[PDB]
Amino acid sequence: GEFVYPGLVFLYIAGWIGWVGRAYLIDVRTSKKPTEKEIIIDVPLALRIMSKGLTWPVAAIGELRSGKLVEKSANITVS
Amino acid sequence: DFLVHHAIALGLHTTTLILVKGALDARGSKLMPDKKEFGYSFPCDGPGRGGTCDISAWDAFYLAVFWMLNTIG
């Protein structure tokens, strides 16, 4: 109870917030003007994404195994 | 003692961050892809492209000396 239990609770909460933020970013990326939704938040879509974050570990492992979590062709500088 | 060794670890990893960033990005970056033509030490690349103050690797040395002094302190 000194470390491990609060650590697990924090990990759950932080994974929840991070996962829902990433999901909202991905959903906004394909829009007419993503930057406008980037400053002015689409409240209904945000609420839907936020509510779907209860089971974030399962979705995270799902996308890790499905190969839809990481990217391979990203911008880099002159090596 | 626990807290102080952890602050020391913070200082070590941060100074290493600055020095390694200076060494690896010495040959070029996205902001200035031809840094290797300007040598180790040069002031800047002008105010264009948003401003390029403290852009060379010598400046990374300069910044990391402060962190070294803080960590040893």
Binding site: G1, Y5, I40, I41, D42 | -
Partner: protein, 41 residues
């Protein structure tokens, strides 16, 4: 009224509302469950 709803969805206003709700929740929790150092469960 649509313009008002659009203004209320801006980043500073939403951040203010969200952080106010979060701070209120934490303050009330600490009012009813104070001095919590280790997790009993």
């Amino acid at each position: 009224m649509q313009d008002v709803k659009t203004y209320l969805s801006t980043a500073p206003v939403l951040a203010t509302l969200w952080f106010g709700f979060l701070a209120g929740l934490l303050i009330e929790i600490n009012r009813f469950f104070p001095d919590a150092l280790v997790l009993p469960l």
